[PDB]
Each structure stands twice: as structure tokens, then as C-alpha cells.
Amino acid sequence: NNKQYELFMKSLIENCKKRNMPLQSIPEIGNRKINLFYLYMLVQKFGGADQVTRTQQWSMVAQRLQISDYQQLESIYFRILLPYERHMISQEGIKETQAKRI
């Protein structure tokens, strides 16, 4: 528990530095250090960030972390790690997602 975040973490950054710094520095929209995956978990409702950036499913995203800035939201999904949250899915599971054993 509390490790899931650290996972996406290394994922996003690798993207920010690989996507040519698509963000000067994560706007830590939520509370602790970064959390673009949580509110993101909600965007799943739409799946299409740019589609959810201006929908009802966003009022929950944006509000989830307590940002009330739907625009900053997809800035989270799209601007900090679009390809990831969206294209990193792959619907994995047929090879054990969790690399660490229990």
C-alpha cells in the first residue's frame, strides 16, 4: 500500500524528461508531492483527457484533488503525462503487473 503512487511517479517523470520537459515543474495539485495519477484514475471515466478536460467527469477530477481548475486538470493528464495515463494502459495483467512479489 502507498506504493502505487511511487510507481506512476517514476513513470510520469521519465515522460516529462522524454517528452522534452512538457512542464517546468509538476503543479502539485492535491496535497503531497505530485498526484496526477489519482485525479487521473477518475479521468478513466472518459479515457480521453482532452475529452474529459471540459466534461462533468472533470468536476470530480479537478475537485477530487481540490483544484477546481478543470483546465489545470488535463494539464495534469495531457501536459505532464498525456501518452502515459492514456497510452501506458496496455490492459496489462497477463504477466503480473506488480513486479514485486508478496
Helix (H, G, I), strand (E, B) or coil at 96: coil
Give CA–CA dist 71/61, Å, rounded: 11
CATH code for the domain defined by 1-102: 1.10.150.60
Burial label, 40 (beta-carbon count in 10 A; 0-12, 13-18, 19+): buried
What b/e readout covers 93-102, taking b as 16+ CB neighbours within 10 angstroms?
Answer: eeeeeeeeee
- In this structure, the chain runs to a length of 102
Cell numbers for 7, please give them. Answer: 510507481
Q: Could you give phi then psi for residue 55, rounded to 5 degrees?
A: -120, -170
